[PDB]
């Protein structure tokens, strides 16, 4: 329904929706912006991610509440309603993955854009994997493949403190721990990522230092949780 609105107007309204905490609107505006067919800038990629991460985040939180009630339950209502939320979550993930495949990833040539999108692809397959049962293995391998491609590019093209590289490794480590039942791989990735970033902090300005150390703290928090 966004086809008649100017790209610049969609971006402006996505920024307004973020300020208004209207994340479903924000996601619809950014979907419309992507469908204009132009590549996204750094700021626009962040808007897209913020919008859909907040939308899917509400769905994931709801699904976890309903799943817990359903598990303590074992009427059809809690299963039916969990299934409805689960279907809506899968629809949001499929929309995001569709935007990445048509055609954000294939047009992303720079490391910063390609790694961002491949991490996103891994993330939204990971959210699908969180609720998957029947075809879980193929969804898990799709997440792994996207994360792995992103990792290979980030190790060749970005410094170890680059915030996208750090956030990618953070999420791939969560994938290993929570999805792939590979806790030792999760811990090893988080530790190696943290240590290599630490040794690169000396190259950074004060503001880049703050950006990188914020994500490093998340790696440290998880390592503490896991060990």
């Amino acid at each position: 329904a966004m086809g008649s609105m100017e790209r610049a107007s969609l971006i402006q309204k996505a920024k307004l929706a973020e300020q208004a905490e209207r994340y479903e609107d924000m996601a619809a505006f950014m979907k419309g912006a992507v469908e204009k067919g132009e590549e996204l800038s750094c700021e626009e990629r962040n808007l897209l991610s913020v919008a859909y991460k907040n939308v899917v985040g509400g769905q994931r939180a709801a699904w976890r509440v309903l799943s817990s009630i359903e598990q303590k339950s074992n009427g059809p209502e809690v299963r039916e309603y969990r299934e409805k939320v689960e279907t809506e979550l899968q629809g949001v993930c499929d929309t995001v993955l569709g935007l990445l495949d048509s055609h954000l990833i294939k047009e992303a040539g720079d490391a910063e854009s390609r790694v961002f999108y491949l991490k996103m692809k891994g993330d939204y397959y990971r959210y699908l994997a969180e609720v998957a049962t029947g075809d879980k293995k193929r969804i898990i391998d799709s997440a792994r493949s996207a994360y792995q491609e992103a990792m290979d590019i980030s190790k060749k093209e970005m410094p170890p403190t680059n915030p996208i590289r750090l956030g990618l490794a953070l999420n791939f480590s969560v994938f290993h721990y929570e999805i792939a039942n590979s806790p030792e791989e999760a811990i090893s990735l988080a530790k190696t990522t943290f240590d290599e970033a630490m040794a690169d902090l000396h190259t950074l300005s004060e503001d880049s230092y703050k950006d990188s150390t914020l994500i490093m703290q998340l790696l440290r928090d998880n390592l503490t949780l896991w060990t």
């Binding site: 961002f116 993330d123 996208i164 999420n171 914020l214 928090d221 998880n222």
Partner: peptide, 9 residues
């Protein structure tokens, strides 16, 4: 329970 990356980078 583990933390994942912020939406923005």
């Amino acid at each position: 329970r583990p933390e994942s990356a912020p939406a923005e980078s």
